[PDB]
Swiss-Prot record, chain B:
Upper classification of the organism: Eukaryota, Metazoa, Chordata, Craniata, Vertebrata
Extracellular side: 290-300, 362-369, 424-443
Outcome of mutating H446A: No effect on channel activity
Substitution effect: R434A: Mildly decreases channel activity
PTM field: Phosphorylation of TRPM2 at Thr-213 by protein kinase C (PKC) counteracts the effect of cytosolic Ca(2+) and elevates the temperature threshold.
Domain notes: Contains two binding sites for ADP-ribose, one in the N-terminal part of the channel and the other in the C-terminal nudix hydrolase domain. Both sites seem to have a role in channel opening, but the interaction of ADP-ribose with the N-terminal site is absolutely required for channel activation.
Membrane-crossing segments per the record: 269-289, 301-321, 341-361, 370-390, 403-423, 465-486
Listed name of the protein: Transient receptor potential cation channel subfamily M member 2
Curated annotation (Swiss-Prot), chain D:
Subcellular location: Cell membrane; Perikaryon; Cell projection; Cytoplasmic vesicle
Free-text tissue specificity from the UniProt record: Highly expressed in brain and peripheral blood cells, such as neutrophils. Also detected in bone marrow, spleen, heart, liver and lung. Isoform 2 is found in neutrophil granulocytes.
PTM field: Phosphorylation of TRPM2 at Thr-63 by protein kinase C (PKC) counteracts the effect of cytosolic Ca(2+) and elevates the temperature threshold.
Protein name, as recorded: Transient receptor potential cation channel subfamily M member 2
Segment of the intact protein contained: 678 to 752 of 1503
Modified residues (Phosphothreonine): T63
Organism: Homo sapiens (Human)
Assembly: Homotetramer. Isoform 1 can interact with isoform 3. This interaction decreases Ca(2+) influx through isoform 1 and suppresses susceptibility to oxidative stress-induced cell death.
Coiled coil segments of this chain: none
Domain of life: Eukaryota
Domain topic, free-text comment: Contains two binding sites for ADP-ribose, one in the N-terminal part of the channel and the other in the C-terminal nudix hydrolase domain. Both sites seem to have a role in channel opening, but the interaction of ADP-ribose with the N-terminal site is absolutely required for channel activation.
Family: Belongs to the transient receptor (TC 1.A.4) family. LTrpC subfamily. TRPM2 sub-subfamily.
Amino acid sequence: CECAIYLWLFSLVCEEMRQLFYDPDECGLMKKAALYFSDFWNKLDVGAILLFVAGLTCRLIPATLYPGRVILSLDFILFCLRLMHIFTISKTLGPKIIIVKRMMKDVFFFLFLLAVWVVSFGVAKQAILIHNERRVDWLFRGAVYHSYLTIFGQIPGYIDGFPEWLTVLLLCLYLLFTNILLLNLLIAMFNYTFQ
Amino acid sequence: PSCLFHSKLQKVLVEDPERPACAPAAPRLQMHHVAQVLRELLGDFTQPLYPRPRHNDRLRLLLPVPHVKLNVQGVSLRSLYKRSSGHVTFTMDPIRDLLIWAIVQNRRELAGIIWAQSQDCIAAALACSKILKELSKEEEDTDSSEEMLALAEEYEHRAIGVFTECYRKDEERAQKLLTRVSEAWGKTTCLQLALEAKDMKFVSHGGIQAFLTKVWWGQLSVDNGLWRVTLCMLAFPLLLTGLISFREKRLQDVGTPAARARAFFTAPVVVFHLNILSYFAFLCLFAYVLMVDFQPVPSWCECAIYLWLFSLVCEEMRQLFYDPDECGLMKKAALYFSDFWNKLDVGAILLFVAGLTCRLIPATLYPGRVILSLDFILFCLRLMHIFTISKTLGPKIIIVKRMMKDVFFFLFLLAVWVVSFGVAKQAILIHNERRVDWLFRGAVYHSYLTIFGQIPGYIDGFPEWLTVLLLCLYLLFTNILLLNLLIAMFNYTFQQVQEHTDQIWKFQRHDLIEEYHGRPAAPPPFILLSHLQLFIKRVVLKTPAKRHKQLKNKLEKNEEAALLSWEIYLKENYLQNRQFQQKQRPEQKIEDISNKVDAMVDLLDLD
Amino acid sequence: KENYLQNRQFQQKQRPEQKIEDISNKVDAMVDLLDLD
Amino acid sequence: LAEEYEHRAIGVFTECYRKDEERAQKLLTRVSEAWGKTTCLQLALEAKDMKFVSHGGIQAFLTKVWWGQLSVDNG
C-alpha cells in the first residue's frame, strides 16, 4: 500500500502540463507561468506540492519519522481548501465561496484580532489562582492550553476555582467583549457585506 | 390565425376530425369544438358554456344528418336543419362569451371594455386570468406569454379591486357572493376557480381569509385564542358555564346540551384537535409499546398498536374516494405522487413494515428495536407538515420549504468539512482506544462530541502548541464563516420571499380547511364508526353522490338578482373611480399640457 | 438590430421627462409665433 | 460608454434570445473571419462581461456546454 502513494500525484501534474501545453504560445515558458503565478490560489496549489516534499525528506531521514508523522498530516488540509477551490460549483455552494474571497485575508484578520485578544485573558486567568502544573513543554499546557479549552468548554472548574468573587468577575467581564461585541457585531460585519 | 390556440383550434378540428369521432365531414370548426377544448382549458368542472350534448352538439355538421328523429347527435330543436341549428343562443352569457373571444384572438384592450359589460365581473377575472395563464402555459415562446400573465395579474388586479369595493359594502352579502351556484361556468364559484387560477394574491386579501376564518371556526366564535378553548376541551362541564359564548349562545340558542355539543363537534376547529390529540396520544402509545412493551408477545398493550393505522388509511381512502373522477385510479394517485411530502407519508408506512418483518423474524429483535424507532421521527416531520397552522407557525415553515433540500445541503457541506478535522485531530496525538466497531468510536465518535462539548481534554492533550493551533484554526471556519455568514444566508432569504411565503401559506390554508370541511365529527377512536357509516351506506346505496360536505350553497335566481344588479352597479361604480384614480395620475396631466399645446401649434395658423 | 434599437429608442422615447420638455420645445416655438404683426 | 455598449450588447441578445434561441446559441459561436477567433464569448472573457455572460440563456447555453449532450434537468 505504501508504494501506491507515489505516483498518483505524478498522474495529475501532466494534466497541468497539459494545461501548460494545450493552447498557449510556442515561446512563453516563463510568461504563461506568470498567468499561473498571478493567483495566490495557484501558489496554494504549489504549497500542496512542497509540504509533501517537506515531509518526504523528513521521511527519507528515518531519525525524523515524527516529522514524517506531522508534516504530511498538515499537507492533508491544503487539498480540501483546494477542494473548496474546486467545489465552488453550485448556486448554493459557489457564490457563497465567492463571499469567502472577501474573507480569506479576513480569516487571517479575525484570527489575529481574537487570538491576541485571547492573550489578554489567557495570561490573566492563571495570575491570581495558585497553579502548580508544569513540565518541559507542559508548563505551556497548564497556563495556555488550559485557557482556550475553557472558551469552547473544557473548564477545570474544580481546579481554577477568598479570590472567588474575582473569579466570578473577570470571567464575566472578558466574555462580554468576545461573545457579545466580537461575535454578534461580527454578525453585522457579515450580514451587511453579504447584502 | 397567428394565435397558438388557433393552432389548437386547428388541433381541435383534428382532435375530432371528419371520419373517426364526428363521422360526417368536418374540416369546419363548430362551437362544441370550442367547448371540448374549453374542457382542456379549464379543469374538470360542470362546463355548460355551450349546450354541449345532442340537443346542441356542435361537432358533426357538414353532411345531412337528419332531424330530431335521431336525437342522438342531430340538432333541430329551434328551427329547420339547413346545415345549421338556429337561435339556440348563448345560454347564459352574451358578453362574458365576448370576454373569451377577445382574449382567444388575444385582444387585450377590447376585453377591457367587454369586461365592463360582462356580467361575471369577478369569476371571469379569475378564470380568464387562469386562461391567460393557460395561454402562457401552452406556447408563446416570447413577447406575449409575459403579457398574458401581466394582463392576468391585471385582471387579477381587476378582481382585486372589485372585491375591494364589495367587501366594503355588505361584506356579509359579499361572502355569500363568494358562494354562487353551478349555472354560468358551472361549479367553482370564484373561490374554487382561484385554486387552479393560482390566486396567491386574491385569497390572501382582507376578508377572503376572514371568511375562511369563518369556514374554519365554522359556527361558534372566531375571537378566542388557544388559551381557554383548550381548558374546555378537557374540562367537559366548563362549557355549560359562561366561559365562551357560541353563536348559538350569542342569540342564546343553547337550550340543548347536545346542540351545545354537536355544533361544537362539527366545528372544524374541534375536528382538528380531536384528530390531533388522539393521534398525538397514539405517538405516546407507539412509544409505550416500545418503552415497556418491548416484548416478543402480543400483550394487552401490544395488540393495540395494530389497527390504529388501519383506522386512518380509510380516511385517505375517503380522500381517495370523496370527489375524484369515477375512472382515474392511477391518475388521481399521480396527484398524490406529485408531492414528495406524500411520499414522505409513504415512508412512514413502509418503515413500519421494515421493522414488522424484522419483528416477525425473532432473530432480528434488535432490528425490531431500531427500525420502528426511526419510524417515530417520520411522523413529527409529518406533524410539522400538519402543524403548519399558525401565523407564527405556518409561513415560517413555508420558509423551511426553501430549506428542506438545504437541510441536506448544509449537512453535506459541514459534516464532510468535519472530516477535514475529524481525521486531523487523531493524527499526531498517540491514541490507543480500539475495538471491533469501537475503533470507529475512538477516532470519529470522539470528534463530533468535542464540537458541541464532550472534550476529553485530559486525553487529547511537545505537540501541545499545535494542539492549541489547529483547534483555533479549524473553528475559525465553522463557527465564524459557516455559522455567522449562514445567518446572512437566512436573514436575506427571509426578507426576500416573505411576501410570497405568507400569501402562498394563505393559499394553502384552505386545503386543511377543505379536509376539515369534508370530515365527520368522530375522533380517530370512533372514526371507524364513520368509516363503517359509509360502508353500511355503500351496501344500501351504491353511488358516491350522497352528501357533499363542501361549499354547496344553493342560491335562488330571484335573490341573486338583488345581489348581482347591485354587484353590476358596484362594477361601474368602482371602475369609474379606478379610471378616476388612473385619471389621478399626474403624468397624464404632464402630457395633457402636451396635448393642449399641440392644439395651439395649429391654432395660430389661420391668417 | 434595427428592430430592437427602434424599440430601444421608443423606450427611450417612452421617457416622460422628454415629454416634460417637449412642451418646453413646443412653447418656445410659440414664443416667436405671436410676433408677426 | 463601454457599460452602455455592453448594455447595447445586453439588449441585442435580449431580442435575439427571445426569437430562435437555438439559433442564438449557434450565433454565439461563429468562425475566425472578422476579428478572427473569440466569437463574442471568448471576447467576453477579457472584455470582462460579468454582466453579459450572466444573462438569461448565455449561462443556460453554458448549462448545455456543461451537461454537454445528455440532459440538463436531473439534479
